Amino acid sequence: SMEQVAMELRLTELTRLLRSVLDQLQDKDPARIFAQPVSLKEVPDYLDHIKHPMDFATMRKRLEAQGYKNLHEFEEDFDLIIDNCMKYNARDTVFYRAAVRLRDQGGVVLRQARREVDSIG
Numbered sequence: 001s002m003e004q005v006a007m008e009l010r011l012t013e014l015t016r017l018l019r020s021v022l023d024q025l026q027d028k029d030p031a032r033i034f035a036q037p038v039s040l041k042e043v044p045d046y047l048d049h050i051k052h053p054m055d056f057a058t059m060r061k062r063l064e065a066q067g068y069k070n071l072h073e074f075e076e077d078f079d080l081i082i083d084n085c086m087k088y089n090a091r092d093t094v095f096y097r098a099a100v101r102l103r104d105q106g107g108v109v110l111r112q113a114r115r116e117v118d119s120i121g
Helices: 002-027 056-064 071-088 094-119
Strands: none
Touching: 002 056, 002 071, 002 094, 056 071, 071 094
């Protein structure tokens, strides 16, 4: 139907906007601490600590399958990146500190992304 196509166009437009949000968020992680999943070879116990792991590569695979229906879904995954890191790692670590900086800097980007998703429907 034409209605299905139109909904598909909206999903595609959202996907384009989220790809740019994701690039902007990832630039706030120049050390690439959050680029890839935590390795179970190198942290074999990781899943005893963290139930829903997340990373920018895994978000990117979801995005390119148009797997985010709205900004809320995408923000949930971003928040998992940060929140997982701040539980597993201690406060005095390079990892925790990188999460805090990503959170603070990403908040600015997401503040305007929320206005752009509302605004352009």
